[PDB]
Amino acid sequence: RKPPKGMFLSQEDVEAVSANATAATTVLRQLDMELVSVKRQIQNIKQTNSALKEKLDGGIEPYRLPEVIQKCNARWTTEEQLLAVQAIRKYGRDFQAISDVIGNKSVVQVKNFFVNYRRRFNIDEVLQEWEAE
Template sequence: MIEIANDFAEMSKYVTEQPVEGDENASEDIEVVQAVKTKCSEETKAAMRELTRVRSRAIRLECTLKAQRAEGLMNGLDCYKYLTAKEDRKDEEGSSRRDRVRGGHTWTEEERIIAFHCLLRYGRDFDAVAEVLGTKTSDKVKSFYTDMKADIDKLLEKEAEKEQEIVSTFDVEKELSPEVQKTVEVVDIIDD
């Protein structure tokens, strides 16, 4: 308890600024008047600066993670294009499995890509996927998912593994530490 009281007393002390000796700008006729500063206000300012640094670093990290996730989704989208091409070949060969499930309803290539992308993002939330598509009901999205379940599940598992790997390798202490080691290069300029 005494330690807390001593800390409080230390925080309430005024910070005095000593004029610099030999300052040619100093004048006896002019005095600069400032609000009185305490150690508490100085520490508050330091904490605010640190908070700003941590927030900006967190935003940069968030952007980096979003970029990595988007890259992973685009790689998954390439795999999906292959899967839809395979499905189209099955349809051309006379397979009517898709027609049985959907009752003859067709999907455009754009709708397939959007549905696949949404399934990667929202998982098996068919209502959310249908809402994003706008042209399909959740039952039609579920039919689409059922039709390509094995292939989509493999890609969803790969995405979950990639995300888990990113999360497990992310070092919070290192990334959010206030003392970031910066590499400094010293360059000697030689005048001839």
């Protein structure tokens, strides 16, 4: 039913190695090369990836920024409303970013604001102006 375990024979491959006298060694050279040609290929992209990696030496440690420990206040200062509006204009709806920016207002206080003040900060204009970009 099945060939000795680990021995390999498919009907397909059998007819292959018997199509002539040296269809035999044909298929075996053909692969010997086909392999060489994948070894050479492998060097190349190792090399390529090597330099490509050097260029990253340093990581981003020059560019990291200190942490921001601080407490989500409930009141908006006029100062605060103001960064808001601009955050909206710059960002649209990414309520997350907009919260990062203002610094001390939670991702929701943000959305609420979007409505109490929608009133008077013409949040519609602001928002459509954003889309137009």
